[PDB]
């Protein structure tokens, strides 16, 4: 029995699936705690930049969960990703405690750029600016990677790093009423929002779990970006970013919502 998580429907990913767009041939790096083998996931490869964790498997759960929102397989089990044919790469930059260093994150962004990733999902933050982080972001972006990052779960009216840097697409979280989730950070730099409450996805152990956070919102956008790239293979990171905002459903102040709610139907028309 396959279920479709509410968020996947809300961004209207199955309309895009019906048009034949599933993210096929699009390479997506998940910079997180790793990704575990799972019957509803296909991992094409990856790299670890965590000291003394040479494998890319997930000892936390967060990365596996984020990965399934992007690319859970279309079949008779589990859930369904926004872009269920995307090519998933596990880039481990966070440890089991869900924490890492800017050194690790930057090395991951370097690798993504160097290995031709189209999209880099960064469901993570730093509260404090880091030059190393911003140059890493800038670097990946000039190589052609589209960097998507979580705004943060503190509830404040400013957003975390590296989401706050110009070349990273900043994603906040909405609830089932399409309101801003109380924890979702907002303010200057916010680009767009996506479902981030009660998000069911894949979890280590061959199982499924429901989590809340802007970390859960971000992969909806990463997924939607892979659909736009399959339909428009010559488009740049910047064209995709702009088209997602331009086609999003408007929710009110840009301070709070960015351009609004990502809409995969409208972006693949
Ligand atoms: Ca499935
Ligand atoms: Ca930004």
UniProtKB/Swiss-Prot annotation:
Subcellular location: Secreted
Highest taxon of source: Bacteria
Keyword terms of this UniProt record: Calcium, Hydrolase, Metal-binding, Protease, Secreted, Serine protease, Sporulation
Reactions accelerated catalytically: Hydrolysis of proteins with broad specificity for peptide bonds, and a preference for a large uncharged residue in P1. Hydrolyzes peptide amides
EC number: 3.4.21.62
Binding-site positions, Ca(2+) 1: 2, 40, 73, 75, 77, 79
Co-factor note (free text): Binds 2 calcium ions per subunit.
InterPro entries in UniProt: Peptidase_S8/S53_dom, Peptidase_S8/S53_dom_sf, Peptidase_S8_Asp-AS, Peptidase_S8_His-AS, Peptidase_S8_Ser-AS, Peptidase_S8_subtilisin-like, Peptidase_S8_subtilisin-rel, Subtilisin_Carlsberg-like
Cofactor(s) the protein needs: Ca(2+)
Active site: 32, 62, 215
Keyword Hydrolase set for record: yes
Record: residues binding Ca(2+) 2: 163, 165, 168
GO biological process, one term: proteolysis
One Gene Ontology molecular-function label: metal ion binding
Note: Secretion of subtilisin is associated with onset of sporulation, and many mutations which block sporulation at early stages affect expression levels of subtilisin. However, subtilisin is not necessary for normal sporulation.
Record-stated family: Belongs to the peptidase S8 family.
UniProt function note: Subtilisin is an extracellular alkaline serine protease, it catalyzes the hydrolysis of proteins and peptide amides.
Name of this protein: Subtilisin Savinase
Originating organism: Lederbergia lenta (Bacillus lentus)
